[PDB]
Amino acid sequence: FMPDARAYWVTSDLIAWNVGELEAQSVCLYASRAAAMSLSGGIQGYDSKVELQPESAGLPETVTQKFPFISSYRAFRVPSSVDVASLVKCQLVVASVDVTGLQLPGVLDDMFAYTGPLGAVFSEDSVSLHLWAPTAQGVSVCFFDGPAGPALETVQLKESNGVWSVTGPREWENRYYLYEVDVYHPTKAQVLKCLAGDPYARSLSANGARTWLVDINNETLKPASWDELADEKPKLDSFSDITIYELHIRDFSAHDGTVDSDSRGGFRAFAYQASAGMEHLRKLSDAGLTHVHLLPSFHFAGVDDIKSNWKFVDECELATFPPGSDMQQAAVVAIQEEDPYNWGYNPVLWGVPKGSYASDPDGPSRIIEYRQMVQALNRIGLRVVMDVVYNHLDSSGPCGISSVLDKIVPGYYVRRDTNGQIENSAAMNNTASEHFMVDRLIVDDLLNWAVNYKVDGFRFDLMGHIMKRTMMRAKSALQSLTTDAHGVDGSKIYLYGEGWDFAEVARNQRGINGSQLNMSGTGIGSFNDRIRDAINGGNPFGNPLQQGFNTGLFLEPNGFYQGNEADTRRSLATYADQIQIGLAGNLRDYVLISHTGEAKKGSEIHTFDGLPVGYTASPIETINYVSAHDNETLFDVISVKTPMILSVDERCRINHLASSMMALSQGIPFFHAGDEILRSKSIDRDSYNSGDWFNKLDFTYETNNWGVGLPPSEKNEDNWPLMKPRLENPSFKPAKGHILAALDSFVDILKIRYSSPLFRLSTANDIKQRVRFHNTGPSLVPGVIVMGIEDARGESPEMAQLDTNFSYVVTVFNVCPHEVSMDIPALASMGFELHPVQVNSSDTLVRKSAYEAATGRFTVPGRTVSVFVEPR
Numbered sequence: 001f002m003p004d005a006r007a008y009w010v011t012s013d014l015i016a017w018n019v020g021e022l023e024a025q026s027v028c029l030y031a032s033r034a035a036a037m038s039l040s041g042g043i044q045g046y047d048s049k050v051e052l053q054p055e056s057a058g059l060p061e062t063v064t065q066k067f068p069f070i071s072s073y074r075a076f077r078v079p080s081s082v083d084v085a086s087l088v089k090c091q092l093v094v095a096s097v098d099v100t101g102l103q104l105p106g107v108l109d110d111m112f113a114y115t116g117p118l119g120a121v122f123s124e125d126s127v128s129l130h131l132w133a134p135t136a137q138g139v140s141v142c143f144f145d146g147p148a149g150p151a152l153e154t155v156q157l158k159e160s161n162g163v164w165s166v167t168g169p170r171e172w173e174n175r176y177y178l179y180e181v182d183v184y185h186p187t188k189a190q191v192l193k194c195l196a197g198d199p200y201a202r203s204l205s206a207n208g209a210r211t212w213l214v215d216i217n218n219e220t221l222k223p224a225s226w227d228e229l230a231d232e233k234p235k236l237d238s239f240s241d242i243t244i245y246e247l248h249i250r251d252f253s254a255h256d257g258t259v260d261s262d263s264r265g266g267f268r269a270f271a272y273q274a275s276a277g278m279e280h281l282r283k284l285s286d287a288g289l290t291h292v293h294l295l296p297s298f299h300f301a302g303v304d305d306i307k308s309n310w311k312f313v314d315e316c317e318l319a320t321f322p323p324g325s326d327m328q329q330a331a332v333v334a335i336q337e338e339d340p341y342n343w344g345y346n347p348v349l350w351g352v353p354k355g356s357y358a359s360d361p362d363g364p365s366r367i368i369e370y371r372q373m374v375q376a377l378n379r380i381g382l383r384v385v386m387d388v389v390y391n392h393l394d395s396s397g398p399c400g401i402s403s404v405l406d407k408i409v410p411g412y413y414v415r416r417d418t419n420g421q422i423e424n425s426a427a428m429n430n431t432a433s434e435h436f437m438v439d440r441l442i443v444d445d446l447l448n449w450a451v452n453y454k455v456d457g458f459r460f461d462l463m464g465h466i467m468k469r470t471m472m473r474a475k476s477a478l479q480s481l482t483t484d485a486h487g488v489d490g491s492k493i494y495l496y497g498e499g500w501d502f503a504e505v506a507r508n509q510r511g512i513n514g515s516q517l518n519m520s521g522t523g524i525g526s527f528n529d530r531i532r533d534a535i536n537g538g539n540p541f542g543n544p545l546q547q548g549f550n551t552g553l554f555l556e557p558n559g560f561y562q563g564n565e566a567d568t569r570r571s572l573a574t575y576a577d578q579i580q581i582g583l584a585g586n587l588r589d590y591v592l593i594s595h596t597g598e599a600k601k602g603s604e605i606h607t608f609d610g611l612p613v614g615y616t617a618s619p620i621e622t623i624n625y626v627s628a629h630d631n632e633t634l635f636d637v638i639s640v641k642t643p644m645i646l647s648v649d650e651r652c653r654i655n656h657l658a659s660s661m662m663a664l665s666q667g668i669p670f671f672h673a674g675d676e677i678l679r680s681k682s683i684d685r686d687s688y689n690s691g692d693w694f695n696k697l698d699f700t701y702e703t704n705n706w707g708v709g710l711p712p713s714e715k716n717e718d719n720w721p722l723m724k725p726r727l728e729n730p731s732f733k734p735a736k737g738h739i740l741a742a743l744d745s746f747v748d749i750l751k752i753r754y755s756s757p758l759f760r761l762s763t764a765n766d767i768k769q770r771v772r773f774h775n776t777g778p779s780l781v782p783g784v785i786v787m788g789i790e791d792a793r794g795e796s797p798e799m800a801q802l803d804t805n806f807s808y809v810v811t812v813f814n815v816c817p818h819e820v821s822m823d824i825p826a827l828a829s830m831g832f833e834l835h836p837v838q839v840n841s842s843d844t845l846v847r848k849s850a851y852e853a854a855t856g857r858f859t860v861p862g863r864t865v866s867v868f869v870e871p872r
């Protein structure tokens with residue numbers, strides 16, 4: 001007997017099931033505590049049976065608002081005679097034959113939503129444990145002395161209102177434990193005794209095998225001066241001042257010879273202030289970088305915390321293989337499930353630092369070293385953003401070390417389809433943030449990282465899979481934290497995420513989800529894929545050779561057929577429109593003279609697919625990027641899409657153009673770690689499991705990791721024929737000189753952004769008043785964007801003076817492979833000069849940029865971004 005689950009128990013007194021009128025006249029509910037039911041004519045082996053009267057009114061508004069996708073279902077009234085608390089612990093089916101199980105989240109929230117303490121609570125004389133498990137038949141705690149010792153004692157918990165609790169003496173502190181949860185698992189149609197960690201865990205033994213009953217407030221877990229960290233944190237006057245650098249903790253130091261051997265790859269590496277890696281971050285910070293976004297750093301699956309199990313390729317041997325060989329990736333893939341490497345998008349327990357990144361995965365090191373990492377980054381002027389992954393779980397079901405949440409309350413923390421099968425669109429085991437205790441756990445976990453680890457912001461992985469209400473409740477709770485009450489200034493904590501809208505959450509089918517369009521007007525950032533794709537060309541899931549504004553479309557065709565010349569010219573101009581909307585903060589309401597000459601709002605310029613290009617209400621809602629850990633690195637995408645015959649010197653200028661478009665954009669610029677040093681993954685489009693070999697970040701600057709073999713076959717083999725000749729071509733590979741020059745130009749473009757408040761305007765109104773584009777319409781000069789930003793000038797101005805040094809800034813982005821002269825008669829007879837940073841540039845070419853007053857002519861060399869300022 002293995003029923004599906006097509007009916008929903010939505011409230012204490014209502015069941016929803018999509019049956020017909022006649023069928024609805026003979027519906028009954030059947031329960032068996034021992035899960036002993038079977039088919040006979042009817043159901044048999046039940047403890048109890050009760051008729052469900054059809055509720056002719058259907059489902060009430062609260063239900064249909066919470067579960068839109070079942071709003072048309074027939075409703076059935078559960079008699080007041082039923083002991084609901086008892087029944088939800090049983091095997092349940094409804095039947096009319098037609099027999100199916102019940103999806104319980106609605107009734108579980110209706111009856112057992114709980115706001116009291118969860119996890120471990122410490123007092124002077126006691127330790128208490130609290131677990132929400134309203135469907136469990138029994139819960140006990142198993143205690144162990146130590147991460148490896150035998151069970152010492154089992155203690156029964158007692159349930160009240162869905163929550164199991166027990167109180168013990170203070171000496172319980174620092175024991176290890178697991179819960180023994182007896183609960184009905186639908187996937188097995190059996191009541192099983194499951195051994196599970198604490199969802200509210202704050203530390204774990206290796207691999208989360210046991211929960212460590214640690215007091216997170218213990219003084220010995222604090223680095224020196226920890227409680228004073230708020231006072232040492234880098235000033236953040238406005239979210240408009242944010243720039244983001246996205247970095248993986250292992251990539252940072254795995255190859256860094258200036259870090260002690262035993263301390264490479266984890267949290268401790270950040271405590272080496274004089275290391276090549278930390279000096280690099282300090283250089284960026286000094287230039288103006290404000291935030292570092294760290295890839296997943298909580299307890300995820302896919303890397304063993306036990307370092308003695310780690311495997312490694314022979315790096316010396318692999319270095320001997322040809323640059324376009326498939327042998328390097330074969331060697332990497334052979335041990336990719338046993339190496340130290342994963343991006344970490346495989347959540348197990350959200351509230352605990354990843355053990356593999358700690359010096360010792362048992363005991364306190366993971367806590368103190370995480371704190372030391374945050375403190376170290378703050379002390380070089382960088383705020384710390386965590387990549388939080390609340391949209392799915394690594395594992396589900398009653399078995400195995402990697403399943404926790406779904407072991408304890410099966411079928412609740414995970415989203416399910418209308419047959420009761422778990423949804424997998426966000427990798428596997430999608431969560432259901434629409435459910436009250438899931439939403440609670442998400443917000444509680446955010447507050448844990450903000451308060452216990454003094455984390456400065458959060459990037460939400462697949463934010464479109466999270467309910468908007470969860471995002472907003474989190475935002476409010478975070479931003480209300482104060483230094484006086486909580487030790488952190490919550491008003492400075494910044495949130496942003498991936499607002500992709502797809503699969504079962506699209507069309508608001510599970511509620512209003514955290515999509516790009518739905519997050520407009522929330523002050524929560526989202527990744528601007530439109531500017532990304534317009535600059536680079538195509539899309540990460542389209543033909544890799546499709547060119548864009550900054551990869552030669554029309555101007556420098558690459559030989560891939562993309563239409564007639566008129567078609568490519570127009571497609572280039574269309575991409576320019578999309579980029580300019582993005583450069584002006586990707587706003588719904590910003591008015592641009594489009595390539596046809598027609599004035600259009602950002603929302604009226606549409607994606608090749610129908611939706612608004614510009615979708616935000618504020619520049620702080622826009623995360624502008626051309627690169628990230630996903631898909632090809634900036635250097636690799638440029639190497640794929642540009643004409644093969646371009647020199648690496650030319651491509652280095654193109655890299656600078658792309659990162660400069662980000663650095664000089666309104667909104668929040670986002671940089672992939674390595675943008676600044678030409679980082680390559682040898683064209684790996686999805687390097688999550690591609691090891692240190694393909695993910696090398698070389699802070700000696702001797703290499704960029706181009707030409708280290710064809711990348712792993714699973715994600716890349718279809719494109720190997722285009723990759724091979726490029727990887728094999730010595731003319732594609734940059735040398736140290738190119739890498740250092742890329743870093744110098746990146747530092748300078750950051751200095752330019754932070755030289756004028758005009759690049760970082762705080763509101764849509766300011767951008768609409770001040771930001772103008774000057775090369776527009778059908779007769780625009782292809783390959784050039786001219787962006788002016790006005791400040792108060794003359795006597796009696798109609799705007800505030802934002803900039804004490806400059807009254808006007810004009811930026812010309814010239815992607816043409818030749819000098820251009822852009823006449824802007826509107827800007828004639830003004831005091832423009834080349835920006836002092838560029839006058840003093842190590843790049844000889846940008847120094848040649850010039851302004852002629854009589855005509856308003858800005859002369860800009862090929863493949864160059866030139867910034868002109870009018871001094872006060």
Ligand SMILES: OC[C@H]1O[C@H](O[C@H]2[C@H](O)[C@@H](O)[C@@H](SC[C@H]3O[C@H](O[C@H]4[C@H](O)[C@@H](O)[C@@H](O[C@H]5[C@H](O)[C@@H](O)[C@@H](O)O[C@@H]5CO)O[C@@H]4CO)[C@H](O)[C@@H](O)[C@@H]3O[C@H]3O[C@H](CO)[C@@H](O)[C@H](O)[C@H]3O)O[C@@H]2CO)[C@H](O)[C@@H](O)[C@@H]1O
Pocket residue numbers: 301302337343344345346389393394395424425426427428461462498630686687688
């Ligand atoms: O014991 C079985 C098995 O366990 C292990 O592997 C399991 C794993 O535990 C399960 O959770 C799933 S994960 C399935 C998914 O994995 C890969 O996706 C990764 C992406 O490649 C990577 O880029 C990244 O993606 C994130 C991105 O960085 C981020 O910015 C954001 O955009 O979201 C993304 C997710 O948060 O991380 C992903 C997860 O690590 C793989 O490339 C995918 O193809 C794969 O998903 C697809 O296939 C599954 C079916 O398996 C479908 O459910 C999805 O809908 C598809 O899209 O499954 C793993 C394999 O079973 C152990 O590693 C393994 O050894 C063991 O056998």
Ligand SMILES: OC[C@H]1O[C@H](O[C@H]2[C@H](O)[C@@H](O)[C@@H](O[C@H]3[C@H](O)[C@@H](O)[C@@H](O[C@H]4[C@H](O)[C@@H](O)[C@@H](O)O[C@@H]4CO)O[C@@H]3CO)O[C@@H]2CO)[C@H](O)[C@@H](O)[C@@H]1O
Pocket residue numbers: 425426427500501502529539540541607608609630631685686715
């Ligand atoms: O989950 C498994 C997969 O995880 C990884 O995929 C990521 C991508 O790398 C990200 O880029 C992103 O994808 C977005 C994409 O960035 C965004 O532009 C949009 O793409 C649409 C596009 O708007 C539309 O016009 C059309 O062209 O199709 C495109 C693709 O559908 O939306 C994407 C998400 O749907 O996020 C995904 C994860 O969801 C990893 O790279 C993969 O290998 C892995 O399979």
Ligand SMILES: [Ca+2]
Pocket residue numbers: 302335336337338339340341342689690691
């Ligand atoms: Ca791996």
Ligand SMILES: [Cl-]
Pocket residue numbers: 322324325326
């Ligand atoms: Cl070869």
